[PDB]
Scaffold this active site. Sequence first.
Site, PDB file in Angstrom:
ATOM      1  N   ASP A  55      51.200  43.452  40.438  1.00 25.92           N
ATOM      2  CA  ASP A  55      50.253  42.881  41.386  1.00 25.92           C
ATOM      3  C   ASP A  55      50.689  43.071  42.831  1.00 25.92           C
ATOM      4  O   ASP A  55      50.053  42.492  43.707  1.00 25.92           O
ATOM      5  CB  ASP A  55      50.105  41.372  41.117  1.00 25.92           C
ATOM      6  CG  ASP A  55      49.121  41.038  40.032  1.00 25.92           C
ATOM      7  OD1 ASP A  55      48.481  41.913  39.394  1.00 25.92           O
ATOM      8  OD2 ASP A  55      48.976  39.826  39.731  1.00 25.92           O
ATOM      9  N   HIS A  69      43.664  46.480  36.864  1.00 34.51           N
ATOM     10  CA  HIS A  69      43.919  45.203  36.192  1.00 34.51           C
ATOM     11  C   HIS A  69      42.710  44.669  35.480  1.00 34.51           C
ATOM     12  O   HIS A  69      42.731  43.566  34.932  1.00 34.51           O
ATOM     13  CB  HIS A  69      44.373  44.165  37.246  1.00 34.51           C
ATOM     14  CG  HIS A  69      45.624  44.632  37.914  1.00 34.51           C
ATOM     15  ND1 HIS A  69      46.708  43.813  37.945  1.00 34.51           N
ATOM     16  CD2 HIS A  69      46.060  45.733  38.529  1.00 34.51           C
ATOM     17  CE1 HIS A  69      47.749  44.352  38.539  1.00 34.51           C
ATOM     18  NE2 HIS A  69      47.364  45.556  38.907  1.00 34.51           N
ATOM     19  N   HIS A 142      37.702  33.099  41.241  1.00 30.28           N
ATOM     20  CA  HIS A 142      38.715  33.793  40.443  1.00 30.28           C
ATOM     21  C   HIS A 142      40.106  33.333  40.842  1.00 30.28           C
ATOM     22  O   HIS A 142      40.914  32.947  39.985  1.00 30.28           O
ATOM     23  CB  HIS A 142      38.557  35.295  40.653  1.00 30.28           C
ATOM     24  CG  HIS A 142      39.451  36.176  39.821  1.00 30.28           C
ATOM     25  ND1 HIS A 142      38.944  37.176  39.003  1.00 30.28           N
ATOM     26  CD2 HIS A 142      40.802  36.228  39.738  1.00 30.28           C
ATOM     27  CE1 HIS A 142      39.928  37.820  38.431  1.00 30.28           C
ATOM     28  NE2 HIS A 142      41.020  37.245  38.862  1.00 30.28           N
ATOM     29  N   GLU A 146      42.850  30.995  38.689  1.00 26.02           N
ATOM     30  CA  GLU A 146      44.192  31.418  38.293  1.00 26.02           C
ATOM     31  C   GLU A 146      45.281  30.504  38.810  1.00 26.02           C
ATOM     32  O   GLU A 146      46.317  30.360  38.164  1.00 26.02           O
ATOM     33  CB  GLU A 146      44.412  32.883  38.703  1.00 26.02           C
ATOM     34  CG  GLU A 146      43.564  33.787  37.804  1.00 26.02           C
ATOM     35  CD  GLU A 146      43.634  35.261  38.080  1.00 26.02           C
ATOM     36  OE1 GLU A 146      43.930  35.702  39.215  1.00 26.02           O
ATOM     37  OE2 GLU A 146      43.387  36.039  37.146  1.00 26.02           O
TER      38      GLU A 146
HETATM   39 ZN   LIG Z   1      47.023  38.637  36.154  1.00 27.39          ZN
HETATM   40 ZN   LIG Z   2      47.472  42.001  37.339  1.00 26.88          ZN
HETATM   41 ZN   LIG Z   3      43.075  37.864  38.344  1.00 24.60          ZN
END
Ligand SMILES: [Zn+2]
Ligand SMILES: [Zn+2]
Ligand SMILES: [Zn+2]
Length: 245
Positions: A55, A69, A142, A146
């Site tokens: 990431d 991703h 989103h 998370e």
């Molecule tokens: Zn992730």
């Molecule tokens: Zn990711």
């Molecule tokens: Zn995500």
Amino acid sequence: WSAEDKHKEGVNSHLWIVNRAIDIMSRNTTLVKQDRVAQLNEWRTELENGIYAADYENPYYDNSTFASHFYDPDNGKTYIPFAKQAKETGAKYFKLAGESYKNKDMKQAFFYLGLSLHYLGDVNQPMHAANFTNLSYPQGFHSKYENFVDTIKDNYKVTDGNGYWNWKGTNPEEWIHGAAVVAKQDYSGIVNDNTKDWFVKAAVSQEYADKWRAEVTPMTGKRLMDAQRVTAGYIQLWFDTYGDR
Ligand SMILES: [Zn+2]
Ligand SMILES: [Zn+2]
Ligand SMILES: [Zn+2]
């Protein structure tokens, strides 16, 4: 899922999923060779570096678009036309890891395995299997979802030794696709008119912040449990494939 601290589970859901998957392997006393667990712990720094790197830098985060991703199993695509998706990308690093393992370059092998585990982890997040990004409507949901998952994830540990051994075939792409199929089915248990409504109203009312968080909790726990079992199976597949047989 989040991956904000390289070596700390608190704000790294990806590392928590992998560590819980390793615990499933350790709990299994019928099929898993425990030296595999010892190898993952011996090269844990490199494995964690790979889980985090996805990431944070190129090529893995696709110039901050994170296109690789995501993977929608119904059309085989990510959210940006013609970009690379999570199935081909996770499978690429599974094979690079295995080639490095066979050549006895453990630092390279476990870093590439960590990358592959990250991509498999992402397709277990329903938004990533449905091309719902942080710019999708309602924008910002989103990312807040998370972050919220990190605060509850400890309540969903799998506490038995039953990973999904030989869940799909020997091709890692089949595992990444299969996990995305299950995650996209669970998408409406997280993203729907009600959660959209409450998220938007949560800006002004605290009561609505609690409402959407409670609403997405049950399917979040279910997805986190499946992600641990699938990840354990996938690690076992990797060692079965490249571990000398
Ligand atoms: Zn992730
Ligand atoms: Zn990711
Ligand atoms: Zn995500």
